[PDB]
Design a protein around this ligand. Structure first.
Ligand SMILES: [Zn+2]
Ligand SMILES: [Zn+2]
Lengths: 237, 147, 168, 122, 391
């Protein structure tokens, strides 16, 4: 429990914990974390069968072994062959806003499972969506300069908003559970299709799988650590 | 090691294998129980040469058959005869044991109880894999050489 | 020294090759396990030996460089606060992080962070911090260094408590 | 590989029984009075060193899984360079680090194990 | 000129971040949690056990913050004054009762989180804040009780309704366990725990599998629970557990399970088997069988359903746990990681304030019941709540 776990990335600060007794047991939320408030699963459960989810009542395993089993908040509601198209739709509905952003949907392809969570208490952060619905080049972040222009336009006027970015499927909320199924790029620049010897040594972009991109890596920090200058040049403790 | 023998990487290895506890489970690939009624002719092809070759210079129709691995075998300096005559010297006359020789391409041991058979066997199968000591001292598990 | 830093980058690059080879070796299934040890156990063993050999030789290259004017070296020569490991982590490679005696574990399924692909046992994946403190750490390096850091804070609390009762 | 059968009528597990006169293997039910001859004489199998489980997860949509690594080797069948690959799915300590590939064109499973001992990988 | 479809750069990130904080601030966790309560969770608690043997409660209204004065009008209360005056920044909680004979109403006070929809500062402009002696820089995810500013620290706990297999220390006779801690989202959170244990360690004779039901004084072999549920034939049962016919290793693992359930060959004998491990020696068969039906219907996997016609749903789920449990004993899966943050949950103001408020609304409900049995011929202790919360 008091050890800094891998799944804490982006959700809880890796530096701000107290010394001694409370060490590792008292944590602090990273700048961009949020905690789910709670939502009704009825609509989703309703939509699920409207889209071919065979009821568990009439499920015969020896007859359809490939079938993906679907759960919602821990409950096994049924089975579904060809989950691929359902998951596409599910992601589109949440990216429009028809499914509350707070909701978490995970599909484990190899594990044959599709789990949906609607309960409160789930911690999550926002990431840039990197779908490749763009032709011109390759996979790119859906947020383009034009969007940022609107963002900064609204700033200056002190109405394009954070919720706008959410509604237009440009950014998504992601919890540790869903995090398992994605591949996140650190710098948006790495989706790029004689070196400064003073810079630090970074790795290479061997990816064509990217599904998301970090808004900014320094957001894994909490409030207190966000005040340390050049924290990345200090010994951890 | 004994005084006049400290450079012999060969003796070190010997003593190592004579200390490192070794059960049958550490040398077995898999175990199977077959219904093989005629103690002479076998339903298993590969074992014909072995039941023949065991007539030169009671038994239930149920057969417990273990397939041993050479790597682990020769590694832990073990002979088919050693392994077999150890199992035999474990289950009193309460068990018929035969085994292929060290030359055959497959290391195999056959056993018959000597009616609730099928059951006693899965139990005997267990005693063999965990309880019988083929070589080594009780409690001594890993054993490494250093210089 | 500008050239020294280059001798350092190459020294580490040479380490990442030795590690890459043993991996291909293991993937082809050519590595032989050392008695009383697992393939994976001895694999890890060689990788960690390579990676520390690197941090270390990388550190010596920096130590030798520094002149007698170098204040850090002046303090080290006198005996007052200082040590190789410090000069090594500040100037050359910081090194391999580790929790419970091993490289960073697959906390997510088959990976250390969602930023990597599954089944990636390379040094950058499993926690090798290539940069010095001077250069700065990448975000992944930073998190791994914090995982390792927390360990020391936790048992420093333990060591503290346990020793006080043993003494009494 | 002891693939067992169930009763024709009451669908319960069948148990091995010996026909002491013709010396052959049967399988009776302990509910009804059903009984059948045995397919093979193998009645039990215990693999101390196993292989099953290593390939678990090879699904039709495996290619769409973003977390999996990709290589451009050639598959012994259609020489297509579209592969996804993983290490043994078993979760034993005494496993190797061999890679299993999945052709994303013909969904064929091949391996990097230069000591490849099996033919089906299941 | 600034092609609006041009890729974004690393510097453009802060624009997206400034946008984030412009809308959420720094303590949205607090505000949002409390707001979800006052706006929904509150009303939902007023409908659970909202009926008495009649008196049924309906809608709820929440007042702006105000003070109960001794020798004076009920005053509007602002945070600044509550801090100084050692007061409590709370608001009036009014319900809507429907009194009906069978054989508005003020009810307690709710301390309000600063800057939540209810607080007077949420809609205040900058100057409104200065005139109110409240720093425009204040964030406000807290309460003001008896004058002191109080914060509800997030409580991290394991999530409910989640299967988890775990290995076990060499000593114990149970080699593996699959656990789920089911609980209903609303109404009353009854955390009945289900455990599916695998007896015997690698190399023990006939490793059996038994499950632990609530109120039942003996672990019950899984085959018997399946029959108590209506799945009788071995064949049908194994199918609910092993969703692959070629997996002879897993099916082999259940062989001893089937044997361990032989004696019982029908639903009633299965129910009686269970009922007897939860009843005294002088109770009648029907009563027993009934006891076991009610248990499997309300104490067994309650998160799935608590109604009737849902026994196939529980059978498949129970089968799923057995599956995952064996998948671990067969060394095909690693035991679950108890430290994975995705399976944790952080309780905040709202959820926290909902445990106490349930518990208290239930005591206010008991009292109202003691105002009927004792009444042979408006008797509401509002303080029961205002004190409970406050305390
Ligand atoms: Zn039958
Ligand atoms: Zn192919």
């Amino acid at each position: 429990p008091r050890q800094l776990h891998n799944t804490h990335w982006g959700l809880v600060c890796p530096a701000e914990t107290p010394e001694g007794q409370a060490c590792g047991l008292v944590k602090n939320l990273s700048l961009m974390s949020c905690i789910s408030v709670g939502t009704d699963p009825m609509p989703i459960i309703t939509f699920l069968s409207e889209w071919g989810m065979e009821p568990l009542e009439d499920y015969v395993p020896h007859q359809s072994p490939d079938a993906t089993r679907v759960f919602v908040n821990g409950v096994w509601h049924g089975v579904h062959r060809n989950p691929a198209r359902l998951m596409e739709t599910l992601r589109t509905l949440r990216r429009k806003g028809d499914i509350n952003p707070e909701v978490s949907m995970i599909r484990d392809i190899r594990e044959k499972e599709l789990k949906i969570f609607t309960d409160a208490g789930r911690v999550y952060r926002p990431l840039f969506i990197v779908e490749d619905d763009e032709s011109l080049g390759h996979k790119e972040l859906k947020v383009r300069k034009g969007h940022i222009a609107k963002l900064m336009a609204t700033e200056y006027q002190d109405e394009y908003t954070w919720s706008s970015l959410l509604n237009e499927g440009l950014v998504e909320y992601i919890d540790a559970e869903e995090e398992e199924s994605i591949l996140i790029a650190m710098q948006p620049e790495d989706l790029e299709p004689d070196v400064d010897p003073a810079k630090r040594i970074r790795v290479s972009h061997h990816a064509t799988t990217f599904t998301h991109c970090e808004i900014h890596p320094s957001m894994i920090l909490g409030v207190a650590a966000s005040i340390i200058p050049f924290p990345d040049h200090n010994q951890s403790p | 090691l004994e005084p006049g023998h400290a450079a012999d990487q060969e003796q070190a290895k010997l003593i190592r294998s004579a200390i490192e506890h070794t059960t049958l489970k550490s040398v077995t690939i898999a175990s199977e129980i077959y219904y093989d009624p005629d103690p002479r002719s076998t339903v298993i092809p590969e074992d014909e040469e072995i039941i023949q070759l065991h007539f030169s210079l009671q038994q239930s129709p149920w057969l417990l058959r273990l397939e041993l691995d050479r790597a682990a075998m020769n590694d832990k300096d073990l002979t088919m005869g050693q392994v077999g005559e150890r199992i035999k010297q474990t289950f009193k006359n309460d068990l018929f044991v035969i085994w292929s020789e060290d030359n055959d391409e497959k290391l195999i041991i056959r056993c018959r109880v000597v009616a609730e058979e099928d059951h006693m066997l899965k139990k005997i199968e267990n005693t063999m894999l965990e309880n019988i000591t083929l070589r080594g001292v009780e409690n001594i598990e890993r054993v490494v050489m250093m210089k | 020294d500008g050239p020294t830093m280059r001798e350092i980058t190459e020294t580490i690059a040479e380490a990442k090759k030795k590690v890459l080879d043993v991996t291909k070796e293991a993937q082809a299934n050519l590595l032989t396990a050392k008695h009383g040890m697992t393939l994976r156990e001895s694999f890890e063993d060689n990788v960690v030996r390579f990676l520390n050999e690197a941090r270390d030789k990388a550190g010596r290259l920096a130590e030798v460089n520094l002149k007698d004017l170098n204040n850090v070296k002046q303090m080290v020569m006198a005996g007052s606060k200082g040590s190789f490991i410090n000069i090594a982590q500040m100037s050359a490679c910081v090194g391999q992080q580790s929790v419970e005696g091993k490289r960073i574990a697959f906390g997510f399924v088959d990976r250390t962070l969602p930023h990597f692909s599954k089944d990636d046992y390379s040094p950058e994946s499993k926690g090798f911090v290539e940069n010095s403190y001077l250069r700065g750490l990448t975000p992944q390096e930073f998190f791994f260094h914090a995982m390792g850091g927390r360990e020391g804070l936790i048992d420093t609390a333990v060591k503290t408590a346990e020793t006080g009762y043993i003494q009494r | 590989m002891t693939t067992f059968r169930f009763c024709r009528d009451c669908n319960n597990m069948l148990y091995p029984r010996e026909d002491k006169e013709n010396n052959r293997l049967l399988f009776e039910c302990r509910t009804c009075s059903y009984v059948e001859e045995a397919g093979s004489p193998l009645v039990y199998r215990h693999e101390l060193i196993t292989n099953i489980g290593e390939t678990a997860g090879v699904v039709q949509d495996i290619g769409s899984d973003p977390t999996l690594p990709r290589s451009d080797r050639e598959c012994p069948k259609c020489h297509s360079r579209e592969n996804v690959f993983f290490q043994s799915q078993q979760r034993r300590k005494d496993t190797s680090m061999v890679l299993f590939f999945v052709c994303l064109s013909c969904s064929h499973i091949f391996t990097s194990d230069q000591k490849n001992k099996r033919t089906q990988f299941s | 000129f600034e092609d609006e479809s041009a890729p974004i750069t690393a510097e453009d990130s802060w624009a997206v971040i400034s946008a984030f904080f412009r809308e959420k601030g720094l303590v949205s966790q607090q505000l949002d949690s409390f707001n979800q309560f006052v706006d929904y969770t509150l009303q939902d608690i007023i409908c659970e056990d909202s009926t008495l043997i009649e008196i049924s409660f309906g809608k709820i209204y929440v007042t702006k913050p105000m003070v109960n004065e001794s020798d004076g009008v009920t005053h509007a209360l602002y945070p600044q004054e509550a801090r100084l005056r050692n007061l409590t920044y709370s608001s009036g909680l009014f319900v809507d009762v429907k009194k009906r004979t069978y054989e508005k109403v003020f009810i307690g006070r709710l301390p309000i989180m600063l800057r939540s929809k209810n607080c007077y500062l949420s809609e205040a402009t900058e100057s409104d804040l200065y005139k109110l002696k409240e720093c425009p820089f204040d964030m406000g995810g807290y309460f003001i009780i008896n004058g002191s500013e109080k914060v509800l620290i997030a409580q991290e706990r394991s999530a409910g309704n989640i299967v988890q297999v775990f290995k076990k220390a060499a000593p114990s006779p149970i080699s593996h366990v699959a656990e789920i801690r089911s609980a209903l989202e609303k109404g009353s959170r009854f955390i009945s725990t289900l455990q599916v244990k695998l007896y015997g360690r690698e190399g023990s004779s006939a490793r059996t599998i038994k499950a632990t039901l609530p109120y039942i004084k003996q672990d019950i072999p899984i085959v018997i629970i399946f029959r108590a549920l209506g799945i009788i034939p071995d064949g049908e049962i194994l199918e609910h557990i092993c969703y692959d016919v070629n997996d002879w290793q897993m099916l082999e693992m259940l062989k001893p399970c089937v044997e361990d359930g032989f004696v019982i060959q029908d639903r009633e004998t299965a129910l009686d088997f269970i009922g007897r491990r939860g009843t005294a020696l002088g109770i009648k068969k029907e009563k027993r069988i009934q006891y076991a039906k009610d248990i499997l219907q309300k104490e067994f996997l309650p998160h799935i359903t608590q109604l009737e016609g849902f026994e196939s749903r529980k059978a498949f789920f129970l089968g799923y746990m057995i599956n995952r449990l064996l998948l671990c004993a067969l060394d095909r899966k690693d035991q679950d990681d108890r430290d994975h943050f995705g399976k944790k949950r952080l309780d905040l103001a709202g959820p926290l304030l909902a445990q106490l408020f349930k518990t208290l609304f239930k005591k206010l409900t008991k009292d109202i019941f003691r105002y009927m049995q004792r009444t042979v011929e408006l008797a509401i202790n509002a303080k029961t709540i205002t004190s409970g919360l406050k305390y």
